[PDB]
Design a protein around this nucleic acid. Structure first.
Ligand SMILES: [Mg+2]
Ligand SMILES: [Mg+2]
Ligand SMILES: [Mg+2]
Ligand SMILES: [Mg+2]
Lengths: 95, 99, 132, 95, 64, 197, 243
RNA sequence: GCUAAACCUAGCCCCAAACCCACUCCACCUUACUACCAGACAACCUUAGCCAAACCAUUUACCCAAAUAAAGUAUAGGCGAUA
RNA sequence: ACCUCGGAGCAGAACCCAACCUCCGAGCAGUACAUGCUAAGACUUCACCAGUCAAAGCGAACCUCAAUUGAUCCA
C-alpha cells in the first residue's frame, strides 16, 4: 500500500490500523472485539464480557498489518505507567 | 606517475559573495557566521558580541517565555487548587452516597 | 554590543565533557572475580595449539543466533590457531549433557564455530577456567 | 468586505518559505459579511451650530451616512484628531 | 584523520553524490534539487515520468 | 550494567556521574528526537552492587535508591527538556554552533509533584527531608544507614547543579570556543539577570 | 543541459543588468521589499503559537493570505484593500456535497473625495472599508500618505501619493494663490510625510514607465566628433604653447 | 552467377562548468517580406479531466527557493482509498 | 421467483456435502433483576469476522424456547 511516495520515496502507514490495533515487540497484535458497545441489552453477560476482553491476531493478518504499517510502529518503546511492558517481551517460548 | 595532491578542505572560513543570487541565503544569515566562528576560532574576523541576541530578540523571548512557561509559585498554587477541588468533589459525592 | 569579557580557566570542565575514542584498559581490581561476572584473561596465556582472543570490550567472543525463528545456536567467533582441537574439546565437553555429540560447524577461514542449542554460559565458563 | 476561512487545513510551512497550496485549499467558506454587522456612530467636531446636534467647538457622535454626506463635504465639521481637539479645548478654556 | 568522506570525492551531478535510488527517487530528487533550472520539455516529461512511475510502482505487479 | 561499567573502568566513580558521562561511556544511547525525556533506574542488579557513586538521573526506583544508599552513593533526579537533553547527550555539536548555553526549563504541568517529592529524590525537594526518606528506606529494607559526612569525598558526593544549569562548571549565557580555546561571558546586565533567572 | 540560474531569478537579473540597472537604489529597494499586506478577507491568528482544543499541546500557526483578484477598474478607482474573491464552496456547507464555483464581489459606491493639498474633488468608486479606514486615519490625505503601497493597491492612489509628495517636497506657491498662510499651515500639518524631490518623483511607478523616464533622461543628441576633436586639439595647442 | 551482403563515419545522448541571442544595402502587420496620408481599437479571471477509490457523487501526490534527519511522526480524510 | 437464520429427508451408521430439490418455521415472546465481576480448559457452521460451554474464586441465595437477527465510520 503506497510503496513509494512522491515527496520522499518511502513507504507510508495507514492510520486505520494504528487507531484499531496495537503491536507488541514480540510481533503480536491485539484488538478490541467487535460489537462491544452495541446491542448490549440482548447480549448475555458472558457474550458481552467475551466482546469486552482483548484478543490477539493470527499470523497471516499479523504479517499483513506489519506490511501495512512501517517500522516506526514496530520499534521498542519505554513508556511510563504503560501496563504492557510485561507483554512487549516474550517468556518461555519453544518451537 | 606523480600522484595528484590529496584533496583537502578550503583552509579558513568560506565567506561567499553576498551580491550573488545563486548563493543561498543561510550563509549570509548570522547563524552561518556563528558556525564559522565556533569552527575556525577567532580567525574568522567575526565580532564575538554579535553571537548573543540583540535586545529586540531579548524582549521577544522574555515576553513569550513569561506567557507560556509559568513560574514555580504559579505551578504549585495551580496544583494546590486542583487537588483541593478534587478533594471537594470526592467529599461531597461520598457524603451524598452516605446519606 | 555587549562588553564580552573572556576567560580560559573553566576549560577543564569542557575537556571533561569531551568524550574518549579508545576503550580504557580496566583497572587492576585487588580481588577477582570482579562483580557482574567479569574476569580478565590469564597471563601468560596457556601454550596450546590454539587461542581465543577477547573483543573490543574485553569480553569473550561467544555469541548467540536465532535463525528461521527456530534454529537456536551459539557461535565462537575469533579463535586463533587449531580450531579442530577446540571443536573436539567442546564435543567431548558437551556430549554428556545431550547424550549426543554436537553437530558443530567450523569455518576455519574466519575461524568460527557455529553450534546447535544455547550453551553460552557453559562455554564462557569453560573458556574462563582455561584462561582465554 | 466579506470574510472567509479555508474549509481544509493548510500544511504548516517555514517562515522563510511560502506555503504549498492546492485546490483543496482554494475551497473556502464564508464566516461574516461585515455589512450586516451593527453600525457604531463616529465622533466628530462641529464648527457651525446645527439643529439638535451641537454648536461650535462641540464634539458629538453621529451617523456615518450623515457625516460623509453633508457635514464633511460642506466643510462644516472635522474629525476629532489630537491636533485639532487640542485647540478646541484651548478655545473652550478661553471661553 | 577523517578530514573528508570519500563521497564528496566523486565528480558528477549535484543530485547524485553519495546517494543511490531507483527511478522514482532519482527523478523526485532531480526535480526537488535542480528542478528550477530544468528546461520546459525536460521538466514536463520528468513530471509525466514520475506520475506514471507513481501509479506503476503503487498499483502494478505481484505482491499485493 | 552500571556495575559492569564501573568495573570496565570507562566511567569513573571518583567524579560525579552524569548523563553526559554515561553517554560518553556509551552506557546508554539516546534518541531525543524520539522524545525520550531521560533515563530510568531499574530494580535489576540491586544485588552484587558496590558502586558508591554519586549518580544523577531523571527517574529512579526505590529499590535502586536503597541499594545505592546502602553502598553509600547518592541519588539525584533532574528533569530536562528535549532540546536540553539532546545538547546534553551531544554537547560538542552545539559548541560547534557557538550559541550560548541555554538555561534549563522547569518540569511541565505534571512532573512537578514528582521532582518536588523527597522520596523520589527530587532536586526541588528540600534537603532537610532527605535524611527522613533515607531513614524510612533503611528501616524498610533492613540495612544500616552509613552517614557519609565522614568520608573525604563527601564534597564530590554532594556536588550538585542548581536548576537552570546544565553542567557543574558552566552556566547559562556562557559561551565556549574550542579553536583558540576560550570561554566568554556577556557582562551585559540584562543578559546576566536573564540567564540567572 | 541546464541553466546557470533558476527561472525565478531572471526578472531581477534583468533588473540588475540593462537600462534599469542605472535606476536609483531606493526604487529598486521599494521593488525588492516584499512587504506583507494588511489582511481584510480573513481574521489572522493573534499569536504564532496556539493550544488546540483537541490535545493539550503547542502547535505553530501561520496565517495565509487569500489570492485576491484585482480588475483594472480597481486600479483606476480606489476600492481599498479588497477585491474580487475567486474560489469554490460546498452546497449547504456540507463536505459530503458538490463543490461549486463561487465569486465574492464587494459592494462599490461612487462617492466624492476632496483634498485641500491638491485642491480638487474627485469622483471614485470606493467601499465602506475604505471610508472606515480613512475615518480612523482622521483625514484623506493622511490615509493616502500613511498607507502601505500594497494595502493601497491602486495606481490612482499611488499617483496621488506621487503628486502629494512632489508638492510637499517642492513647497510650491502653485497650490495657494494669495494664501501663503494657509499654504504654510497645510505644509506644517503634512511636514512629516515629506521626502526628497527625486524620491517623490520616482515613487509610484512600475518598471516600464520607470525605464521610460530613465530613457527620456538619458536621451540626447551625441556630441559631434568634430566638436570633441576641436576641444582636444585646442587643449594640445595650449599645451604646446606652454612648452 | 545474379539479385544481394559486409563496413564507419557523419553525428547524437547524459552530466559538469559557463549565462544567452541579435546586416546597421532595400522590404516585411494592406493579401506579411508591398517606397509614401487624418484611426482613436486595445491584456490583466480558481485550470479541468482521465485515473485510483475495484461503481461514483467528498476526496485522489504533480514541486518553487539547504541535501540528509526528525518523519512518512503530529495532523487531515465517504477517519477509506489516500494526502 | 429468490437473496439472512433455524429444524427434517436426500446425507440410513464420527464430521462435512449441493440443485430455481422435497417439507416446516423464525425477524418474537414469558419470568427475574447477582440477566453481577472475574477465571483454568475446550468447541466452533469448513478462512477471518463472528458464534458457543464452563470448572474455580469474590460477592450472593438457601433463566425457558429452535431460528427469534446486523460489522466499521458517524450521530
Ligand atoms: Mg544473526
Ligand atoms: Mg470530483
Ligand atoms: Mg473454524
Ligand atoms: Mg461457579
Amino acid at each position: 500500500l503506497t510503496y513509494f511516495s512522491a515527496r520522499k520515496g518511502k513507504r507510508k502507514t495507514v492510520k486505520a490500523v494504528i487507531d484499531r490495533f496495537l503491536r507488541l515487540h514480540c510481533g503480536l497484535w491485539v484488538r478490541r472485539k467487535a460489537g462491544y458497545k452495541k446491542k448490549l441489552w440482548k447480549k448475555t453477560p458472558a457474550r458481552k464480557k467475551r466482546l469486552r476482553e482483548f484478543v490477539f491476531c493470527n499470523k497471516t493478518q499479523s504479517k499483513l498489518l506489519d506490511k501495512m504499517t512501517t517500522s516506526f510502529w514496530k520499534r521498542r518503546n519505554w513508556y511510563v505507567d504503560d501496563p504492557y511492558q510485561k507483554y512487549h517481551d516474550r517468556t518461555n517460548l519453544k518451537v | 606517475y606523480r600522484a595528484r595532491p590529496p584533496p583537502r578542505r578550503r583552509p579558513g572560513p568560506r565567506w561567499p559573495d553576498p551580491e550573488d543570487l545563486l548563493t543561498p541565503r543561510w550563509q549570509l544569515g548570522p547563524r552561518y557566521a556563528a558556525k564559522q566562528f565556533a569552527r575556525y576560532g577567532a580567525a574568522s574576523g567575526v565580532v564575538p558580541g554579535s553571537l548573543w541576541p540583540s535586545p529586540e530578540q531579548l524582549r521577544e523571548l522574555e515576553a513569550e517565555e513569561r506567557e507560556w512557561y509559568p513560574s514555580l509559585a504559579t505551578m504549585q498554587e495551580s496544583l494546590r487548587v486542583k487537588q483541593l477541588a478534587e478533594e471537594q468533589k470526592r467529599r461531597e459525592r461520598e457524603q451524598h452516597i452516605a446519606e | 554590543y555587549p562588553r564580552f569579557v573572556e576567560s580560559v580557566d573553566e576549560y577543564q570542565f569542557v575537556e571533561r565533557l569531551l568524550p574518549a575514542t579508545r576503550i580504557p584498559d580496566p583497572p587492576k581490581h585487588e580481588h577477582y572475580p570482579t562483580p557482574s561476572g567479569w574476569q580478565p584473561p590469564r597471563d601468560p596465556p596457556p601454550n596450546l595449539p590454539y587461542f581465543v582472543r577477547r573483543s573490543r570490550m574485553h569480553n569473550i567472543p561467544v555469541y548467540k543466533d536465532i535463525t528461521h525463528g527456530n534454529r537456536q545456536m551459539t557461535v565462537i567467533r575469533k579463535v586463533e590457531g587449531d580450531i579442530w582441537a577446540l571443536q573436539k574439546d567442546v564435543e567431548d565437553f558437551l556430549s554428556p549433557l545431550l547424550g549426543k555429540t554436537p553437530v558443530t560447524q567450523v569455518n576455519e577461514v574466519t575461524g568460527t564455530l557455529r553450534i546447535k542449542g544455547y550453551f553460552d554460559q557453559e562455554l564462557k565458563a569453560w573458556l574462563l577456567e582455561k584462561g582465554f | 468586505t466579506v470574510i472567509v476561512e479555508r474549509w481544509w487545513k493548510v500544511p504548516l510551512a517555514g517562515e522563510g518559505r511560502k506555503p504549498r497550496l492546492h485546490r483543496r485549499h482554494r475551497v473556502y467558506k464564508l464566516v461574516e459579511d461585515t455589512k450586516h454587522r451593527p453600525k457604531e456612530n463616529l465622533e466628530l467636531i462641529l464648527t457651525q451650530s446645527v439643529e439638535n446636534v451641537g454648536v461650535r467647538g462641540d464634539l458629538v457622535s453621529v451617523k456615518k451616512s450623515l457625516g460623509r454626506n453633508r457635514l464633511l463635504p460642506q466643510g462644516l465639521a472635522v474629525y476629532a484628531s489630537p491636533e485639532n481637539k487640542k485647540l478646541f479645548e484651548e478655545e473652550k478654556l478661553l471661553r | 584523520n577523517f578530514e573528508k568522506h570519500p563521497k564528496e570525492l566523486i565528480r558528477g551531478p549535484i543530485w547524485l553524490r553519495g546517494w543511490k535510488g531507483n527511478e522514482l527517487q532519482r527523478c523526485i530528487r532531480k526535480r526537488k534539487m535542480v528542478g528550477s533550472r530544468m528546461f520546459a520539455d525536460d521538466l514536463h516529461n520528468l513530471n509525466k515520468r514520475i506520475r506514471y512511475l507513481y501509479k506503476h510502482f503503487n498499483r502494478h505487479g505481484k505482491f499485493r | 550494567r552500571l556495575q559492569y561499567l564501573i568495573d570496565l573502568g570507562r566511567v569513573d566513580p571518583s567524579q560525579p556521574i552524569d548523563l553526559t558521562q554515561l553517554v560518553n561511556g556509551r552506557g546508554v544511547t539516546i534518541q531525543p528526537l524520539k522524545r525520550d525525556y531521560g533515563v530510568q533506574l531499574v530494580e535489576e542488579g540491586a544485588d552484587t552492587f558496590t558502586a558508591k557513586v554519586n549518580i544523577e538521573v531523571q527517574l529512579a526506583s526505590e529499590l535502586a535508591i536503597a541499594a545505592i544508599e546502602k553502598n553509600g552513593g547518592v541519588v539525584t533526579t533532574a528533569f530536562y527538556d528535549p532540546r536540553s537533553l539532546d545538547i546534553v547527550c551531544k554537547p560538542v555539536p552545539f559548541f560547534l554552533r557557538g550559541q550560548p548555553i541555554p538555561k534549563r526549563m522547569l518540569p511541565p504541568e505534571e512532573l512537578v509533584p514528582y521532582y518536588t517529592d523527597a522520596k523520589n529524590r527530587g532536586y526541588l525537594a528540600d534537603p532537610a527531608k532527605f535524611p527522613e526518606a533515607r531513614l524510612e528506606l533503611a528501616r524498610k529494607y533492613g540495612y544500616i544507614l552509613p552517614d557519609i559526612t565522614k568520608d573525604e569525598l563527601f564534597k564530590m558526593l554532594c556536588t550538585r547543579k542548581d536548576p537552570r544549569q546544565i553542567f557543574f562548571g558552566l552556566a547559562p549565557g556562557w559561551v565556549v570556543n574550542m579553536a583558540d580555546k576560550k570561554i566568554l561571558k556577556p557582562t551585559d546586565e540584562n543578559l546576566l539577570k536573564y540567564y540567572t533567572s | 543541459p541546464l541553466h546557470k540560474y533558476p527561472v525565478w531569478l531572471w526578472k531581477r537579473l534583468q533588473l540588475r543588468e540593462g537600462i534599469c540597472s542605472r535606476l536609483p537604489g531606493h526604487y529598486l529597494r521599494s521593488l525588492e521589499e516584499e512587504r506583507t499586506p494588511t489582511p481584510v478577507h480573513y481574521r489572522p491568528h493573534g499569536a504564532k503559537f496556539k493550544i488546540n482544543p483537541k490535545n493539550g499541546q503547542r502547535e505553530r500557526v501561520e496565517d495565509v493570505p487569500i489570492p485576491i483578484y484585482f480588475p483594472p477598474e480597481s486600479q483606476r478607482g480606489l476600492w481599498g484593500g479588497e477585491g474580487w474573491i475567486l474560489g469554490q464552496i460546498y452546497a449547504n456547507n456540507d463536505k459530503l456535497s458538490k463543490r461549486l464555483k463561487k465569486v465574492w464581489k464587494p459592494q462599490l459606491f461612487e462617492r466624492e473625495f476632496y483634498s485641500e493639498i491638491l485642491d480638487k474633488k474627485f469622483t471614485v468608486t470606493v467601499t465602506m472599508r475604505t471610508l472606515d479606514l480613512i475615518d480612523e486615519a482622521y483625514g484623506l490625505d493622511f490615509y493616502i500618505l500613511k498607507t502601505p503601497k500594497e494595502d493601497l493597491c491602486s495606481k490612482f492612489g499611488m499617483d496621488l501619493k506621487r503628486g502629494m509628495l512632489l508638492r510637499l517636497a517642492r513647497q510650491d506657491p502653485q497650490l495657494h494663490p494669495e494664501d501663503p498662510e494657509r499654504r504654510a499651515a497645510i505644509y506644517d500639518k503634512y511636514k512629516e510625510f515629506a521626502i526628497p524631490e527625486e524620491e517623490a518623483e520616482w515613487v509610484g511607478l512600475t518598471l516600464e514607465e520607470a525605464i521610460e523616464k530613465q530613457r527620456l533622461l538619458e536621451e540626447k543628441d551625441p556630441v559631434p566628433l568634430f566638436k570633441i576633436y576641436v576641444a582636444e586639439l585646442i587643449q594640445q595647442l595650449q599645451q604646446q604653447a606652454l612648452s
